[PDB]
Automatic annotation (TrEMBL):
Species in which this protein is naturally found: Klebsiella pneumoniae subsp. pneumoniae (strain ATCC 700721 / MGH 78578)
InterPro entries according to UniProt: CoA-bd (IPR003781), NAD(P)-bd_dom_sf (IPR036291)
Domain CoA-binding: 9-104
Coiled coil start-end: none
The organism's place on the tree of life at top rank: Bacteria
Pfam families assigned: CoA_binding_2
Name of the protein: CoA-binding domain-containing protein
């Protein structure tokens, strides 16, 4: 099994990290958060406001460099350009996977990961990636 793709990273370690997890239930960043939590996945929301607080039962953090748990998949839904800033940071600490917002295309953030080898995935969301096979509860 010498497969070098997201399949091995997702099948090996499943870790989802949320960037900019605030108290805005009227945003796509929230709907995706509680969505991954209910589905039964490890959600690690990190925000400058949740730093030292509890979000939906998940420990909050001011920065991704403050959480002990190693992130495996960075969920960036905040904004388009946000993917770039969140990408460099992830690759810095030693990320493994990167997920952006579905419908958007960022060549800058895409290559920004290739430079390190990180698995960058743009124009794709977990909400639709889950049911893609039919394992949605």
């Amino acid at each position: 099994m010498k497969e070098n793709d997201i399949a091995g990273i997702l099948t090996s370690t499943r870790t989802i990290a949320l960037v900019g997890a605030s108290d805005k239930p009227d945003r796509p960043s929230y709907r995706v958060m509680k969505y991954l939590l209910d589905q039964g996945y490890h959600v690690i929301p990190v925000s400058p406001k949740v730093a030292g607080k509890t979000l939906l039962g998940q420990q909050g953090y001011a920065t991704l460099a403050d959480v002990p748990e190693k992130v495996d998949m960075v969920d960036v839904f905040r904004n388009s350009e946000a993917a770039w800033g969140v990408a460099q940071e992830a690759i810095a600490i030693g990320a493994k996977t990167l997920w952006l917002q579905l419908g958007v295309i960022n060549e800058q953030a895409a290559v920004l990961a290739r430079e390190a080898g990180l698995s960058v995935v743009m124009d794709r969301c977990p909400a639709i990636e889950l049911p893609r096979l039919g394992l949605a509860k």
